[PDB]
Design a binder for this molecule. Structure first.
Ligand SMILES: [Cl-]
Length: 218
């Protein structure tokens, strides 16, 4: 990883896409199923196999169902309390998703304003204490750009972009990565619910991250 200094610890935090069914009892680092079976585990395998010398220490702090509201509540213990050199954050999917599968529960919804304010605040507190901070855009595996949820997901993605630019964060365009993939297959080939993909879908996410950090190839 060119972007990452050698021997650095990277903490990746987010929802179930980050979680990927890890054993939370271990705390992100461990021997068996500490990273789950998603893109985080793919990143860890990729970096070890292609860059053994780089000695990168990856931590999975993904919690299923989480919004940016949930992230802020546990940020002290799950991010700062681990003393990371780098922090990668991917959040927004559930923030957007609840507005569509639970449209009547207004109280639950995270409005664009709250999403920006909270996301910007987490970054503002974390940016100086780390060597680098990576923001991975939320996505919707749906090529239809005028789909209510896809268009809404695009709103939150753009919002994450102007936060990354404002604090000099690295932005991984995961949505764009899926958009390139979807030129060849229907979303069903990746994810029935257009959110939780198979291993191939997680590889799309992982490869977007690696490319943005300049360690896709070796
Ligand atoms: Cl989730």
């Amino acid at each position: 990883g060119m972007y990452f200094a050698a021997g650095s610890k990277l903490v990746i935090i987010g929802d179930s896409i980050t979680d990927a069914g890890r054993d939370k009892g271990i705390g992100g680092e461990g021997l068996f199923n500490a990273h789950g079976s998603g893109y985080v585990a793919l990143l860890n395998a990729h970096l070890f196999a292609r860059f053994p010398e780089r000695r990168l220490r990856l931590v999975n702090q993904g919690n299923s169902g989480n919004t940016v509201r949930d992230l802020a509540a546990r940020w002290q213990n799950d991010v700062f309390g681990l003393k990371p050199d780098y922090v990668a954050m991917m959040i927004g999917i559930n923030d957007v998703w609840r507005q569509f599968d639970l449209p009547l529960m207004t109280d639950r919804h995270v409005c664009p304003e709250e999403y920006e304010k909270t996301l910007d605040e987490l970054v503002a507190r974390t940016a100086p204490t780390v060597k680098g901070m990576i923001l991975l855009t939320p996505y919707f595996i749906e090529p239809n750009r005028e789909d209510a949820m896809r268009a809404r997901m695009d709103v939150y993605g753009d919002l994450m972009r102007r936060v990354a630019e404002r604090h000099g964060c690295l932005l991984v365009d995961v949505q764009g990565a899926f958009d390139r993939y979807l030129q060849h297959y229907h979303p069903a080939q990746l994810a029935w619910d257009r959110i939780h993909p198979n291993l191939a879908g997680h590889q799309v996410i992982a490869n977007a991250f690696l490319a943005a950090t300049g360690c896709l190839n070796s």
